[PDB]
């Protein structure tokens, strides 16, 4: 029932509008704020294009009380042109946790929902 | 309740919206409709989308397009550039009203090919 | 509670054995709710639709089949549920599947890859919807 989708440090998204919309979730500084606790399905997209060649996608929780970062689904790929990334997930989140997308070195988005 | 899976039939330009085995092995519809290529909803609500496509500038975009306004809104979409294979995946939450309709595209126009839905 | 899995870290069955992918079932990010596991497969405990996925991290050094397939009663082969074909000095490549299922008690779902190499970047679960 809470859900959020959200469109195009760690990267930073439009929460509303159009299709964006938070939904039983806050958010703060590219984080989804969980407020409600469960299993969530997390998702994000992100789009590539150019001209370690190695991109590297992840969705990432993290916690107010702690610094570092915890990794929770991550992607690492190679290669006039364009890629896209795609990450899905289903990750137990306590009220309080804050999940982030990174990739390391409109389209793209970043979204989650309770299951 | 509402939820669906369709996998790939054979079409078929326009871009275009391909079409959609609905009741042969894997495919169902349950809460929601089908017509010439598109996912039709019925009950308004969240629902998670998602298309797969099997690939076989040289450059394919593969997109999830909604109808209510006239014309077609993006709702998700990606661009690759790949005896080759590729695959590209879509999926994301968005807000459907009775009578929205939602459907698939690929540039330079398929079976482990499916498209699908469920209210969230 | 949902059924819902979500299973973590693959690594190859037995040379010789067969097998599927094998996952880390209980730690870190790894739970099974209403599931069960049983040599690398999701075993249904409740009949009904289920969003199935799936991502394998690949890479090596120089055509990759990544499918989910089903296991049911009295059918020596295992069916084809979603499956991805994939073609990429080192190199990586992550190929991502989902989808909804519908799945009987007693049925069960692996993952295998073709051919296999290949905690967070590779992973296989489920929950009913």
């Given at each position: 029932?809470?859900?959020?989708?959200?469109?195009?440090?760690?990267?930073?998204?439009?929460?509303?509008?159009?299709?964006?919309?938070?939904?039983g979730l806050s958010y703060h500084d590219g984080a989804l704020v969980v407020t409600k606790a469960g299993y969530?399905?997390?998702?994000?997209?992100?789009?590539?294009?150019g001209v370690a060649s190695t991109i590297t996608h992840g969705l990432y929780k993290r916690t107010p009380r702690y610094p570092e970062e915890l990794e929770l689904l991550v992607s690492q790929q190679s290669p006039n042109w364009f890629d896209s990334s795609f990450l899905?997930?289903?990750?137990?989140?306590?009220?309080?946790?804050e999940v982030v997308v990174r990739v390391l070195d409109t389209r793209s988005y970043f979204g989650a929902f309770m299951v």
């Open positions: 029932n809470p859900a959020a989708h959200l469109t195009g440090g760690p990267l930073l998204w439009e929460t509303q509008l159009g299709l964006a919309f938070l939904r969530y399905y997390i998702y994000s997209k992100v789009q590539l294009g899905g997930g289903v990750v137990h989140l306590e009220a309080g946790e």
